Design a protein around this ligand. Structure first.
Ligand SMILES: */C=C\C(=O)N1CC[C@H](n2nc(C#Cc3cc(OC)cc(OC)c3)c3c(N)ncnc32)C1
Length: 282
């Protein structure tokens, strides 16, 4: 009994469900083909992803899934977020249709492009390596995504490389912006205060994830201790490949006083200059 929205509705018959993209996980998300998403090209098929409830679902799981859709509707369309493409609401179980990212999440994507011969950080797949310009480009893109969300007054609350998806064209797309401790600003850990500024903290941890080609942060640090260490001014060490400039950016993102962290506007501008001066040669 969900209200019809003709801005977004797709007839179930124009949707062909393929294989699950999930690896036995949250909700369900399957690959599909959508017939005539564009009303001006109704004979073209488009590869899409489809989120639906599992068999074992509750009336809170459905309300959560509904909220998510209604929010994506309000936030609007950007290159660097996962966009809503449509929905099947009326004729059976709720389907939410979104953009397909062929290369998976950003952690996986970076891991698979690690040098094979690193004992420190092994390659668990061996895809072509990324230049340092490619890596600064990933960070620029995710920052643009977040600049947009921020401008729509959306606070992500769990920005991380897991929650960034990568397309066939290597386009970074922020996910789950409408629904872990080691990505949370201290004021989020302590006082449960979430802001654009606490998102900027998380983006710092995400820069670290990028430049470690998908490392796990604070390696060996127990969660229980984590708060105290940070209060005492503990920060992660620079990654080995990371320039001093980009480490400064991470540290700035990790300012203890929230008001002193840079904005996503500033980070975008800064990553735009950095990308342009960074070489692809290595
Ligand atoms: C349980 C499945 C899972 O965790 N996957 C990770 C990799 C696979 N995968 N998930 C998605 C997605 C999605 C998505 C993103 C949203 O962004 C706001 C909102 C959604 O529902 C309302 C769903 C995905 C995509 N898009 N392409 C490729 N693989 C994907 C399964």
């Amino acid at each position: 009994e969900l209200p019809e929205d003709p801005r977004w509705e797709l007839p179930r018959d124009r949707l062909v469900l393929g294989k699950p993209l999930g690896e036995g996980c949250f909700g369900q998300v399957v690959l599909a083909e959508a017939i005539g998403l564009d009303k001006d090209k109704p004979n073209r098929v488009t590869k899409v992803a489809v989120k639906m409830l599992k068999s074992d679902a509750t009336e809170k799981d459905l309300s959560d899934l509904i909220s998510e859709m209604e929010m994506m509707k309000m936030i609007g369309k950007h290159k660097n977020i996962i966009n809503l493409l449509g929905a099947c609401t009326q004729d059976g179980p709720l389907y939410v249709i979104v953009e397909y990212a062929s290369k998976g999440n950003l952690r996986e994507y970076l891991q698979a492009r690690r040098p094979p011969g690193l004992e420190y950080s092994y390659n668990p797949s061996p895809e072509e390596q990324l230049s340092s310009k490619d890596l600064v480009s990933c960070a620029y893109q995710v920052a643009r995504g977040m600049e947009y969300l921020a401008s729509k007054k959306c606070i992500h609350r769990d920005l991380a490389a897991r929650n960034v998806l990568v397309t066939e064209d290597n386009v970074m797309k922020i996910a789950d912006f409408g629904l872990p401790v080691k990505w949370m600003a201290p004021e989020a850990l302590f006082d449960r205060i979430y802001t654009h500024q606490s998102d900027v903290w998380s983006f710092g941890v995400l820069l670290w994830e990028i430049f470690t080609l998908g490392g796990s942060p604070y390696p060996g640090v127990p969660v229980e201790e984590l708060f105290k260490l940070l209060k005492e001014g503990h920060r992660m060490d620079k990654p080995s490949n990371c320039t001093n400039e980009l480490y400064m950016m991470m540290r700035d993102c990790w300012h203890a006083v929230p008001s002193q962290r840079p904005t996503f506007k500033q980070l975008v501008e800064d990553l735009d200059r950095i990308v342009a001066l960074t070489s692809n040669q290595e």
